[PDB]
A paper describes a structure:
The proline-rich antimicrobial designer peptide Api137 inhibits protein expression in bacteria by binding simultaneously to the ribosomal polypeptide exit tunnel and the release factor (RF), depleting the cellular RF pool and leading to ribosomal arrest at stop codons. Separation of cellular extracts derived from cells exposed to Api137 in a sucrose gradient reveals elevated levels of partially assembled and not fully matured precursors of the 50S subunit (pre-50S). High-resolution structures obtained by cryogenic electron microscopy demonstrate that a large proportion of pre-50S states are missing up to five proteins (uL22, bL32, uL29, bL23, and uL16) and have misfolded helices in 23S rRNA domain IV. These data suggest a second mechanism for Api137, wherein it disrupts 50S subunit assembly by inducing the formation of misfolded precursor particles potentially incapable of evolving into active ribosomes, suggesting a bactericidal mechanism.
Numbering used by the authors:
A (entry chain 2): 1 to 46
B (entry chain C): 1 to 231, 243 to 271
Write the structure that this text describes.
Amino acid sequence: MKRTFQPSVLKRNRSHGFRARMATKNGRQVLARRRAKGRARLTVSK
Amino acid sequence: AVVKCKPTSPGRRHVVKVVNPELHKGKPFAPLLEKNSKSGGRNNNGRITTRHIGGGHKQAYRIVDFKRNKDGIPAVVERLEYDPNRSANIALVLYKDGERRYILAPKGLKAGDQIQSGVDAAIKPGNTLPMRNIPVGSTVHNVEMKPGKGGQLARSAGTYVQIVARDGAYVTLRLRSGEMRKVEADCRATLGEVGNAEHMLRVLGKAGAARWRGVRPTVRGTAMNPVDHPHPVTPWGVQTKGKKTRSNKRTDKFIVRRRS
RNA sequence: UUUGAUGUUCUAACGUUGACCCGUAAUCCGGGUUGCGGACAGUGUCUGGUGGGUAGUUUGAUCCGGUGGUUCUGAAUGGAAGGGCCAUCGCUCAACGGAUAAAA
RNA sequence: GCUCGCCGGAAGACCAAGGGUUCCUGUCCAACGUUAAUCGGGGCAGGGUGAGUCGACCCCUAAGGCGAGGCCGAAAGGCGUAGUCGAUGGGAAACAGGUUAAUAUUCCUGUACUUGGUGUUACUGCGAAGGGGGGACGGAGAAGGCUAUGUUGGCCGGGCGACGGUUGUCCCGGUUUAAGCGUGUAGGCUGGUUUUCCAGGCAAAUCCGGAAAAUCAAGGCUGAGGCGUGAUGACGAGGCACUACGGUGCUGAAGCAACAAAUGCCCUGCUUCCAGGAAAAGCCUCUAAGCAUCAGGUAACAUCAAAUCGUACCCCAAACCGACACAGGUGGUCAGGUAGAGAAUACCAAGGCGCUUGAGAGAACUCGGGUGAAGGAACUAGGCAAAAUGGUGCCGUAACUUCGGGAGAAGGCACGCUGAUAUGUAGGUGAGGUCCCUCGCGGAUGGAGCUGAAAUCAGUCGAAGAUACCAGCUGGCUGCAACUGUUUAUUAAAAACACAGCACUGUGCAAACACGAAAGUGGACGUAUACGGUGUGACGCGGCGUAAUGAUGGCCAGGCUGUCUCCACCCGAGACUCAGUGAAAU
RNA sequence: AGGACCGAACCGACUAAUGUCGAAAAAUUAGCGGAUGACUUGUGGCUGGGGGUGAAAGGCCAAUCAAACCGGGAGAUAGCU
């Protein structure tokens, strides 16, 4: 059975990319939370 | 014409086709073509607003001249074509000035006939005359409700409206629904009745006909769960089967009679 | 003379998902012209009815007090309203120590 | 290195997505490989990715997203125009051979091709977000020419050979060559030349469209393939000389005919059908504004540039998704020989592998199978499972029926091989010669040669010739449901859901209905022969019947058999012993 | 021509067996139905939680659905263990 996750760089970038996050106001808040927490990888990117 | 298919198999056993030999067996006039992207019942929000709509064979929208603003320009009807967007076939018209357009083909229109629009036009079927000029007690179609609107009434196959009285600047029209409407005289209309009157004889044979025509399966209320459907009421709680919903109070002044 | 309810007509309010022109290589939008309706429709507050479509729930007590007398008191003074004192009265509120005025 | 076996429409080769050096070499068994391992997709070091012609990049855009102004909404924010993104699509160009341990359509050898800038030469009107053509399209199906590809024959080099014969009608290996260039054929499309005029193509136009005429009847467009150049070039079986003994250098004969032939090309072709089958850009043409001694364009020549990014490796898997080196899943292309209708099936070429625990014995028992005396469903809730038929050709095929179907109903007989018909027939293809020719890829004779079913007779071997794999059990009664189809991913595939049809009701369009505080949308760029909701579900009169249909419920009959009386033997993996690694619930 | 017939790839799992601390958190073998469409699939987007979608089973919404997941109210409350 095909599993739930089917990798695709284009889909990943356009769904969870930094530009996608910044497009919406809430994504900016999510990025701010990530920066405050201090995680090295703010978002998924190559 | 009407033809009954041999019952060679299920899906042909109950098939009745409406064959029109005089239709054009070729591509439509490309310059007047335009794309028609299906919506599947979705809207701007992307949710479903109308049910039982989706799929279907791809079709191209043909621009049809309903207003008929070419006044005093005699034209020749080149041929007839099948318009997927209308239940009635369309007709290609070439004007003397050298321009081509589409019109609705009435019952008595065939290839090679002559047509003319404007007030200075004869009484032959298909001509565009104001209802003021059209004699009372006649049959017309593609009637306009406002000057220059284009025409909205009697646009389906074999549909026509009767001019029943003439009250000065307004005219009374009986529609195929039994509706008596009062319309301004300056509005334009087309003589005769729409063609392709045999549109009723088709039965579509099987599910696939409607499926590729654009209709999707309909689910009855009883089979639905209480949460999904109230189950005689509509899915949204409106009581159907004998409950009028006409509440406008704006166009009622143009209403003379109600359906009986 | 104030006039309102109603009837006919009209435009200056108002609608125009009618037409023409401009910003504009623009089905949007705004502006200028006109025609169509026009004090109708619609909108804002209030209100009568419907409204499992939706939402919160169930399966002589008590609260309210009717009347009386008593200036006991009555929030600046004098009244009045509201409270206290004594009498009586309205519910087999009987699920009768009665959990809500209001629930299958 | 030699044997045995498996895949071979894949268990082979390419890719797309997805991983990111797992690719090659040197080097070691610290940890992993369900055991050892000197080995590896493991540890460390080094090397490896070469693009004007491959793709990305870039021009345009569909679905969709963002959205200057603008509308709406307490704010957040929602919608949307001009515009901007967005390939899953449309635009320009490369092929053959060779090379490393890893790149090649990128490097080397040869032939080229495409887009723009610069300068010269001779001409000329140029000039658009504007107009016209094209780009630009569905389903199904038949034929003709082709090609990739394969068979035979001729030719070339070799062989005559360890168990009988094999200088012979014998055997082995080769018999390949691209893109570009010119001819342009088979085939398909279309009637052309000239003049005059027209409120049409939101301005104009010599461009498109329309109307008139005089002229010929041919012209024009598209178009695979073949033919010569490409190429007395590369490649080429095989032999020769050295080998760090893995391998490297020299050489190199023939390189032809016929047949069959595809899902690939002519073919976005042609014929029919309703379900009527994208958009834009590049591209050819017309002019508007402005300039026409310019500028610009055309045709030829020389030159410059064509940047940047990925270029290893896996890609039906050990490397991707499944926590695993997981019996699972992953889109497209090429995909040959024999028998075969077939990409099915059995054995093979090319190419790739023996799947990361084995060695002994052959207990009960478990798992998957083969055989079997008699009965042939007596076992079982139940023919559950097992057993049996299964293909081609000839004859024949009942009741019912909506006249289509039932039906392959059911049921009867021949299938192998050899000679003749016929030194392989009919059929298909078709050489050379000859005659014509509006003269080349042009039309007739002709059958050379190749391929080539089906059928009759006679003979012949076997217990059995559709002898292997592949490959319907059959009929009757009967309730349900029109049928096809879909559903409870992961215990219910059905009588359930859905269905074409039927009937009621609502909606007159700024329509109803629904998402939205409202804007605005689908309905519908449709409109009463249109759409929404409701109940039933073909057809004849929710009730009665209903042909066909059904992995539907039940019963019966013919064959069949290990289901059973009753199990017995045998074939493979466990179970048992030895060596190495090594959990669990509780 | 057939929402035609037998039948490969492809789709699904209707029957049987093994697998239940299996190779697989529904798998494998032979039968099985469709296999020109009411078919399937690659890619690219839209429909978002009283909401979406649903040929409709109370089915699916990333192994969780008669109301998903993540952080907070929140150390909710528990006459209960």
